[PDB]
Nucleic acid binder design. Structure first.
Lengths: 49, 136, 328, 123
RNA sequence: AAACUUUCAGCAACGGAUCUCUUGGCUCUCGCAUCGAUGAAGAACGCAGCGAAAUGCGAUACGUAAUGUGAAUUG
RNA sequence: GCGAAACCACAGCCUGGGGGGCCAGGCAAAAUCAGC
RNA sequence: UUGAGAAGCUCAGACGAGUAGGCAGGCGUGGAGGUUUGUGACGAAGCCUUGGGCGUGAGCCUGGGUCGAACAGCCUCUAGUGCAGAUCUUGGUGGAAGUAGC
RNA sequence: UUUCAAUGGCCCGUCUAACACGGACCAAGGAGUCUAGCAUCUAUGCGAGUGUUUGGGUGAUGAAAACCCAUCCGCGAAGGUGGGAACGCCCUUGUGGCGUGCACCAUCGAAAGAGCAUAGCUGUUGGGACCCGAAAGAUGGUGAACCAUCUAGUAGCUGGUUCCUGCCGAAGUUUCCGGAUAGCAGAAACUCAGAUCAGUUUUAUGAGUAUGUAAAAUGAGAGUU
RNA sequence: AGCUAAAUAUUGGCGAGAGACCGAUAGCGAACAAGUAGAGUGAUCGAAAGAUGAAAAGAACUUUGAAAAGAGAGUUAAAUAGUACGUGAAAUUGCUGAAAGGGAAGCAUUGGAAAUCAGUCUUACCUGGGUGAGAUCAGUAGUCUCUCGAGACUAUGCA
């Protein structure tokens, strides 16, 4: 229920992702770093702060 | 071969588990379980419920508590009438094999439940299926 | 499969919860495959493709024909096995029970009271659309409908010269059981699609190929989710010879076996993280007087020039050697 | 790290200076008769992977901050934790009012907007 | 040096690409069966208030009668 | 006064050496017209 | 010490022409579904530029002028999808020249 | 950016050293596409099975969509001995011993189904078949040769065939009979860490300084289809 | 010797609904006057050509000129929309400005001279005391939504 929601939203399509050219950014309002990383995405990471 | 040819994201998970288990342990089991998940569908042939019951239970019938392990599909043989108390662990089970093991027998496992039962792969058998189609 | 919430709170038309619950249908434990749906939905979306072709009666000259004219017996439709179709709706309904595959799919359900959201049976007799906007605001689903209303834009290009002028989003999907006004009540709210529980479509459960469609379930159609898909070991009653698929991984979460007590007891001693950079420069032990002592623990006693002679060095030159020297 | 470029003159397709039909974007020549393909000395150079720039100081402006197209007021918000490695480049079709509100907020986040001065005459 | 030629830039010309449209085409689908010696299809000529690669019409001629709508036509 | 068209890689000095262009030389001033 | 997009991160060595050919990753164009609480009469697309920026490159982002209604990024699907050349097709315009010539 | 200085810089494509052939310039058009069949590889679904779409049922919200499916039908349908993957017990820690030995290969006996469907890639044939060009003939007419139509007549061939970067990268001679086999370059599977090799040099045996044969040096992981 | 519906075919005829089609060299030859203009004695062949503006408000009036037009003017938000009319690319032509040019330019590399452009550099930062403000403070009183307390508040003090 976590790697399920990262191999769906982290690699196929997530509505918050922004294809940058050296990075990718997450448009979520509960992101702590602004980037769409594994240890950063608020959807896959299911205990967050 | 370094990454599976498939896009089954329930099989990127297994490779993410057995390529961890390949490098943090000293077993060549995990360096053989991983060395098969990359192989294509024609390279992992099926193996029947009768050839499994014949492989373990022969000569002295040493079938005490070892889990047969095939990285393929455990199909059925219906010419086998009675099924012994077996225990298998494969990716796919056909719906007539999974109901012919449990009806009188033991456990049907994915390689997940194998890695929490024999993490270093002791007390197992690592069988294959016949690659031979005799012309194809 | 592994473990999920057993009972779902079934809501009311006013927004308050109700004491009665229902078991989680066995479909919601089916595989979530962002890959199989992309392969079926790709093939099911090309089945209502009306053909096209130039008239049948040199492609470099102007006024000339076009190179290899398009022809109406192009393969416009595509076959897909019924067990891969039946796999996709199984997987795309399970995605509709995950609260996080709905946000990433672009839904503003960040206020919805529960997932899967099951409103009561009385919602099947709602008659006027002001009794549907009523419902979608008590349970805070109307923020999705506003996402559809706020966001129609004129179609980019020549879709609009071709009878499609307005693109917009996809609001909730209301799955009913008996059509007693529920279709006609909701069918003039933007975004809202209404489908019977039996004839569920993939082009509405995963629009665009992206799973996680916001589904609002009706209690009378939530019950029929165990007779349409059945279970993993029990036949679906509304389908001959259907059994729900199972998984290649028994626990749906692979980074939480690695950290278990079954694995981390046996593993060998770990190495470090990203390693330190050793030997960044090639120091020279002839021209550096510190690396020389690191390599050779003899530089503290050499005495390269020992006086092994004195003034008293004797000549050692034989007569017969000097005779053969100065011969000729 | 000080930014550096392995080349500053772009590559310019062969004989795209003489003829006006031939455009200046680079196209590798396809004939073995060519002087250029065999790489005769004196002829122009070619795009190769040798001129690839540093994998850390890539995509960076000469200042050191990489670019980022902010096309509305909630696209500069993501740059809150990245104000010392990104410059908020505003997109071109953004109106001359929605532009003047990105500037007044990016300035609070300390983010460099590269072309904040467009359409905005100050008084 | 001026002129002339070449090059750059600005302006004026030429020219009609690009972009945007679209009462047109093309394709698929659905319903229907209806020309003529009671003079058909087609042709010629005419007819408009002012009409000129067009339309409608037949000397009752850019049409009458009958019904319906209801106060226009237009340069 | 009216007014084309063929044609048009870019072109236009000579000597020698491997041709208009290469190498080494002779040299080299605009702008044009009539014989040739 | 946080550097878990494990499709990420990190350390170290060797190597670098390339024809027929083989393999891989990407760039761009017209339409389709999904997405950006997307951009737009305070000026969208286009176009021009002795302006700036990025990428090895195909290309992209942008300032100024012009202009006047639509348009784009991301993930997929789709093809009538990329031009220097074919004594190439159509259109436009040159030198020969105010020469030949009436 | 314009220009100056120094140094370099034979015009592009097609051909087969130069050539020839194409090129006045600019714009827009413009060339391996669709379909059927076969085969390989990969992906997925099910699995001794597999395939809904000829049809039927259903579908009030594009009802040509989605969904369900009867009766046929198509394709398919258990021997020892040596190795050898792996895994136990070891005690010479290991080494080695010891037991069970999958696939595949030898050996002697006479063999426990792997397929079906869909999609993608490349290839191959068949259609207009990458574009363009190459006298023809027929049928029916017009006028005393011409006009449409089949025709999108005909290449062994002539020209052209449209984005970037990276990696590997030949032969250009045979051997038989334009087809082969081998070779060179490649992809997977599966062998062995050994004396398995080596456009190589030694020593020894012979052979009439050269000749070939075997087990030393030197390097390098080799081999199978 | 004979008849007969329905299931079936339908690039035509009278209508209809559509489309992952083309978007003025495309899609029918024909979006416009189109089998029209035009070519051939004839059978037959057979094109080019769409867009001012929201509204024509389509430029009154004065003047030069035989005319065509031109200039002052004037309408428009726009004449940088004037029927040679939406945007207006390239070739190509003329003028103006700056350069260069001794029987070849063209381009590449390194720099001079002229012109010109950008860079956040504008300012910001950080550190004590005093004065005032209050709130997440009160040895404080109340409301609501959630779950004892977590937020939103309304008072009152601002210790």
């Amino acid at each position: 229920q976590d790697e399920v929601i990262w191999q769906v939203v982290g690699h196929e399509f997530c509505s918050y992702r922004i294809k940058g050219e050296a990075q990718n950014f997450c448009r979520n309002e509960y992101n702590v770093t602004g980037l769409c990383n594994r240890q950063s995405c608020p959807l896959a990471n299911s205990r967050y702060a | 071969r370094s990454k599976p040819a498939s896009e089954n994201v329930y099989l990127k998970l297994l490779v993410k588990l057995y390529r961890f288990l390949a490098r943090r342990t000293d077993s060549r089991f995990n360096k053989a379980i991983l060395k098969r998940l990359f192989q294509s569908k024609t390279n992992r042939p099926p193996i029947s419920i009768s050839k499994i019951a014949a492989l373990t239970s022969r000569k002295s019938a040493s079938s005490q508590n070892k889990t047969t392990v095939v990285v393929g599909t455990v199909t059925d043989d219906e010419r086998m009438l009675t099924v012994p108390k077996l225990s298998i662990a494969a990716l796919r089970f056909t719906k007539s094999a999974r109901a012919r093991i449990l009806k009188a027998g033991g456990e049907v496992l994915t390689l997940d439940q194998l890695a929490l039962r024999a993490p270093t792969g002791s007390n197992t058998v690592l069988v294959r299926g016949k690659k031979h189609a005799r012309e194809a | 499969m592994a473990a999920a919430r057993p009972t779902v709170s079934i809501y009311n038309k006013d927004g308050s919860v109700s004491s009665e619950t229902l078991a989680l249908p066995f479909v919601f434990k089916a595989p979530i495959r962002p890959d199989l749906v992309r392969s079926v939905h790709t093939a099911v979306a090309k089945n209502k493709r009306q053909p096209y072709a130039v008239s049948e009666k040199g492609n470099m000259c102007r006024s000339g024909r076009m190179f290899a004219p398009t022809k109406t017996w192009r393969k416009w439709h595509v076959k897909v096995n019924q067990n891969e179709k039946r796999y996709a709706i199984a997987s795309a309904v399970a995605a509709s029970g995950v609260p996080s595959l709905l946000l990433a799919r672009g839904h503003r359900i960040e206020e919805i009271p529960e997932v899967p959201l099951v409103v009561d049976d009385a919602v099947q007799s709602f008659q006027k659309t002001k009794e549907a906007v009523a419902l979608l605001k008590e349970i805070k689903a109307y923020r999705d409908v506003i996402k559809v209303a706020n966001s129609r834009k004129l179609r980019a290009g020549k879709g609009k010269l071709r009878n499609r002028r307005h693109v917009q989003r996809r609001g909730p999907l209301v799955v009913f059981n008996e059509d007693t006004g529920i279709v006609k009540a909701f069918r003039n709210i933007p975004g809202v699609e209404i489908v019977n529980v039996r004839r569920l479509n993939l082009l509405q459960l995963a629009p665009g190929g992206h799973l996680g469609r916001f589904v609002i379930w009706t209690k009378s159609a939530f019950g029929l989710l165990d007779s349409v898909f059945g279970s993993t070991t029990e036949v679906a009653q509304l389908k001959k010879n259907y059994f729900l698929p199972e998984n290649i991984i028994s626990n749906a979460d692979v980074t939480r076996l690695i950290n278990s007590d079954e694995i981390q007891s046996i593993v060998k001693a770990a190495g470090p993280s990203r390693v330190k950079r050793a030997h960044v420069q090639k120091k020279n032990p002839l021209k550096n007087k510190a690396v020389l002592s690191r390599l050779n623990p003899y530089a503290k006693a050499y005495k390269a020039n020992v006086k092994i002679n004195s003034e008293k060095t004797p000549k050692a030159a034989g007569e017969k050697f000097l005779s053969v020297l100065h011969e000729n | 790290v000080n930014i550096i470029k392995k080349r500053t003159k772009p590559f310019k397709r062969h004989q795209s200076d003489r003829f006006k039909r031939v455009g200046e974007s680079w196209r590798k020549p396809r004939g073995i008769d060519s002087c250029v393909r065999r790489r005769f000395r004196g002829t122009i150079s070619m795009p190769k992977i040798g001129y690839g720039n540093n994998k850390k100081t890539r995509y960076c402006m000469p200042n050191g901050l990489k670019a980022f197209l902010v096309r509305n007021v909630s696209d500069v918000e993501l740059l809150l934790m990245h104000n010392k490695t990104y410059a908020a480049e505003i997109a071109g079709n953004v109106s001359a009012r929605k532009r003047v509100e990105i500037v007044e907020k990016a300035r609070a986040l300390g983010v460099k907007v590269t072309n904040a001065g467009a359409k905005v005459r100050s008084q």
